[PDB]
Amino acid sequence: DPRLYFENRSKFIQDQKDKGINPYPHKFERTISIPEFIEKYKDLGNGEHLEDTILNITGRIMRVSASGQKLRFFDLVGDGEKIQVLANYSFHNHEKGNFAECYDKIRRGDIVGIVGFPGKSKKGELSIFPKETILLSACLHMLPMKYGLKDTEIRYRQRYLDLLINESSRHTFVTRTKIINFLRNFLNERGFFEVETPMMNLIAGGANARPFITHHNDLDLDLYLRIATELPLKMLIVGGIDKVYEIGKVFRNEGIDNTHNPEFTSCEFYWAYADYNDLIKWSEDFFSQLVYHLFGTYKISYNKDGPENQPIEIDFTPPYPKVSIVEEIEKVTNTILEQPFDSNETIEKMINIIKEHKIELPNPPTAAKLLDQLASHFIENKYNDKPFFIVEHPQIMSPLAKYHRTKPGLTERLEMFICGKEVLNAYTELNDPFKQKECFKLQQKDREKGDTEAAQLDSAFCTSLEYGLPPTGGLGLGIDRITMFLTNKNSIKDVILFPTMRP
Amino acid sequence: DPRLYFENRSKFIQDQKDKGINPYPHKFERTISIPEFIEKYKDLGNGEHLEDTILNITGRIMRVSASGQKLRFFDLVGDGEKIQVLANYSFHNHEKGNFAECYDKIRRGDIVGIVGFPGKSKKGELSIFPKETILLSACLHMLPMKYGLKDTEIRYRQRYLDLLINESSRHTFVTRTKIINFLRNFLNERGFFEVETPMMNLIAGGANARPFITHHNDLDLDLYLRIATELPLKMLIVGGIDKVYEIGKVFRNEGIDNTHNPEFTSCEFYWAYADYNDLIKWSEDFFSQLVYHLFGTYKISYNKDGPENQPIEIDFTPPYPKVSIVEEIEKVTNTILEQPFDSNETIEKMINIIKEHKIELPNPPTAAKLLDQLASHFIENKYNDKPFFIVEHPQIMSPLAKYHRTKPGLTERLEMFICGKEVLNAYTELNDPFKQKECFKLQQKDREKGDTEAAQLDSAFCTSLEYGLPPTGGLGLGIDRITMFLTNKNSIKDVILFPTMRPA
């Protein structure tokens, strides 16, 4: 039946091309948008017409009805708002064609342009009253009904239908753009300078992830898509751009789930002469101010367990708690971790902690992977009422963070979590090139046991460190996850217009 | 020689560490920046000292001098600006360390923190007068001097050295960011909605270009890096986002030269219910307003032939000329190119023009590539002292542009050129799904002849069109080339922080 609908509508298009018409007119010159029309004529009175004011209006037909052969009613939508179309034979311009013939061909989904006047129906419904209605672009398929899209992957593979049908989706993506705008303005007002660094590099560094690989033909050179922006931005700090940032895509070649899309939008900034404490305060200020900006309050509700389940309240009122990674793992496990974290005493203790709690064993069982799994199991859901920081990660987990000024073995690192999900990662930057090559060599040793996601050594980066990187504080944001929490979405797929799908 | 210097300075660091001193302190709390200092104390009287005003300041030493063991002079730079440092034994805090011991070890390039007071030399030079100076981060290599970067690829391979040494580089990249901010605001003020579409797609469409390809391991799926943002943005128009745009990188897998970098920054916008004419007016409004915003005038100077030759003036006063591509090619070659343009007779005629003029023959010699080569050799430099549009391209060159409402075989398309280089490409959008499929079919015939840049059919896109794409006008800008002209650069490498280079 939809197949036959499509065939009949395609036949209509070809028949028009025969009869003479161009069924897709080039240009219709609109005088007012639908939101503007609503704003302007909202206050008309019941049944009042302004028959002398002729307006040119466009939009998409989303409902079709009739009352006899001389009254046609439509819903017309544009820019997320809707007016009524009231087509009365009494106002029809018969010089442009037979009334019935004009309106009988209009179908739900059709894009039209209307020459008419504003008014209210006898029931007070604000309407455009056409004197002529022109098909501008036909909808050749039947659109799904308001609720006939609910569980479908169609929302993600045919996002335009979702945007037409599900009123909330447009609101979600508006909020996403507002969040990004707020962030860009927040940084620009603080003296920060926005740049673009390469998406493709000889080495994909600045995080611990498996990269995408591609090939430039003319240079005959394999290139890696970036997993982070950290290394070139620090190079720009050496260059004297003392407050610098970048908002754009990065790429990680791993699994897809509700909180992972293979390309995702990050913001990283580098702030010369800042440190860990400045970054804690920046995070608290930014998040409290963003939430207040959007919602006029610091507390929001979030359906963590889905729309059909009870929601929780997340309080963004600062300050947020800070939990030190090592000693919280020590309390939770009831164990005490070792002096050198790589010690086979420590490694065995961590493996046996994972086994004593039936936690999945990482492979290879590197000290860093073990600490990470322990953290995700014993800490990352310590709070759901409030965001919170996991801090003071060991140097073993943090090859680019500066060593802690008073806690040997640890670094001045912070990660903010919302509802168990990481949205922020930041630290006092490691800037002694002699310790940095050290960390890179330890990472190469980890790669010598099967650690694929361990970052490769970047020689250009190390040379730049040798020219003097001032003490600096750097921070990264996960934009998509932030948007998920601020739009009440459970899946990253609901905040990305075209998420990566199984084909 | 540079190896010996780096050797000695690495040893200096190690020795500092042995002796307990940490040469990379964790945190120095600064009171004021160098530009803020310069603004704040600019009206200080010559010779005046504010000993009552202790400030913490940071920067990079860029010049070392002395008058001997009791006066040390330095240049200190930050955020592209510079002050003098006048370290006087008389003002040294001796309880924190020995004066000569502290200042003897400072080297050009070192990042320092200074506790001291502001003042002016008797000759009027704004200076910080240290009571204490702390090394924060040493420079272990000799920095090149003021004119040391002239013609090397050091500027492109170590951009940070370029940004430190050549003041003009920072100006260029500041202007780049200003141009993009201006564009974003220009569009947002007009109701436009910024979005992000995927960098990786099952089919790379939206332009005629060779793509990069990569693989997603977990899904075991080959993907193409996007060559344009056009197709998903039009899908968003179908979805009802009637003014939509994207600024970001796209990727093309072809040769590198002065106007081609394998990744470059484009802006594409889609404007429901607009057409070719609105897009011409938009282009004239945007370029004239951008230039006036940056320069306070509509006329700029551009060294088309490099710094050693006279520049030309480019006048961005609108309106700009419009040159119909087929008509201009016919006038220049004194030919008639009868339709259909991809007929065997017209292809042979075009090939014969190309051979008669010793122009290089496109491979394969499709009708569209022959048209493009004729235009490249014959008409794209018709104007140099002003931008201009080449308009009304044939359908066979323009598979996504709407058939021209009064000139059969052509489309409602415009490209803007500056000094022979394309910076803008726009048209009334093709919104008939049946015609769209026909166009993809033709492009595929060319693909089968060997055109690795012809567009491949995207059925998902054609399906979106079957739900009704309103009449729409779309436009793309090449941000990097625009920035080249507005910063007086001859190479795209001068407006990209880290341009793609052949490995060393």
Ligand SMILES: C[C@H]1CCC[C@H](C[C@H]2Cc3cc(O)cc(O)c3C(=O)N2)C1
């Ligand atoms: C810049 C950085 C700072 C805060 C933590 C984020 C992790 C990042 C991890 C990740 C992996 C992946 O394969 C796909 C994804 O979408 C994400 C994601 O959203 N966040 C981002």
Ligand SMILES: C[C@H]1CCC[C@H](C[C@H]2Cc3cc(O)cc(O)c3C(=O)N2)C1
């Ligand atoms: C969006 C579009 C609109 C106007 C024409 C520009 C062409 C585009 C062509 C190109 C190819 C390449 O492989 C490397 C490059 O840098 C460029 C470039 O800079 N501009 C961009």
Ligand SMILES: N[C@@H](CCCC[NH3+])C(=O)O
């Ligand atoms: N590169 C980090 C974000 C910034 C960390 C601080 N320099 C990440 O991918 O998690």
Ligand SMILES: N[C@@H](CCCC[NH3+])C(=O)O
């Ligand atoms: N996608 C085009 C720019 C937009 C043309 C108008 N839809 C290009 O890459 O040149």
